[PDB]
Hints:
This is part of a larger assembly, with two copies of chain A (about 150 residues) and one copy of chain C (about 50 residues).
Chain A: E1 4-9, E2 12-20, E3 23-27, E4 33-34, H1 37-40, E5 45-47, E6 52-56, E7 75-78, E8 83-87, E9 90-94, E10 106-108, E11 114-124, E12 127-135, E13 140-143, E14 149-150
Antiparallel strand pairs in A: 1-2, 1-4, 2-3, 3-6, 5-6, 7-8, 8-9, 9-12, 10-11, 11-12, 11-14, 12-13
Chain C: H1 2-34, H2 43-48
Organism (chains A, B): Chikungunya virus (CHIKV)
Subcellular location (chains A, B): Host Golgi apparatus, Host trans-Golgi network; Host cell membrane; Host cytoplasm; Host endoplasmic reticulum
Protein name (chains A, B): Structural polyprotein
Amino acid sequence: NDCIFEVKHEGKVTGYACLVGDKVMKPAHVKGTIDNADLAKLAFKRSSKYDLECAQIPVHMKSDASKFTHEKPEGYYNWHHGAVQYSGGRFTIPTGAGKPGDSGRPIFDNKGRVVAIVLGGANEGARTALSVVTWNKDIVTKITPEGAEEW
Amino acid sequence: NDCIFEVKHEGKVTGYACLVGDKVMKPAHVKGTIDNADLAKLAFKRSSKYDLECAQIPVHMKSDASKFTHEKPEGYYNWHHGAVQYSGGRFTIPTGAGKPGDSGRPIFDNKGRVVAIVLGGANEGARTALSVVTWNKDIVTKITPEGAEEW
Amino acid sequence: VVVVSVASFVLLSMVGVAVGMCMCARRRCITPYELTPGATVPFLLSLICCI
Lengths: 151, 151, 51
């Protein structure tokens, strides 16, 4: 809920960054800066392979970090724009359920733990597959449908 | 209401900009920038002869703009701080109706159309004449009462 | 050398001035049309001036 901080460019929100575990995670493809001054001044590292940009969370903001898990059982997960279905290794939401500008939003499990960060997706019939950033054990991996658009 | 934007310098509003027809209008005597980043980054043409800066409205993202007319019949017109009397070809308001910092505010007719932009005024007894920007077919003109001060 | 170099400079300066005043004249003549909401530049004016 309070994981999210806004990323703005020319006064507009172009995506989100949020505090997960011990580090700040944001989409690397999103242009803009973080609204929060304490996070905005952080040095960030980037990986074009994962479209992921991150920095360490300041100690005084440690309590605002969300819980996270690497576990991904088949079932339903929650996020800001309704629910997201996970099966077959793929995260899926109803077509049109998400929009451009929603990148950086976390997906939560039923215990409120962050599972993945949404970067984009593609509309295939009544459902849209998501492009997400998730962790398996000790590394970050990127899951993307054959078709995808950046949000 | 409608399509009026603030112009800020330092920590204060110094005047207003507005969308009239197909063009963005701002008083050239007002320091500071437009609050809306979409307009702030827009290049303007300045003419010191009319105390006026203009730029084309980015109608591709902001097509909403006030309607305008060249007709200026004797009678009453409206603006944000009250009503303005048009008499003898001159715009007149109560002396306490206007003030420094109100420059850039449009004058509307009873059809909701813009006829003029307020730049300043001069005190004549209990009433003050306004220094305004007006236009007729294909030409913009500036009408300034003697002793009028910029607002 | 002095006369040719100076005369060339002066002649080029005069041309630069002639051009400079032409663009100033165009800016002054056209601005009032671009400064006016809803205004359309007359064909003749848009024909002779680059706008």
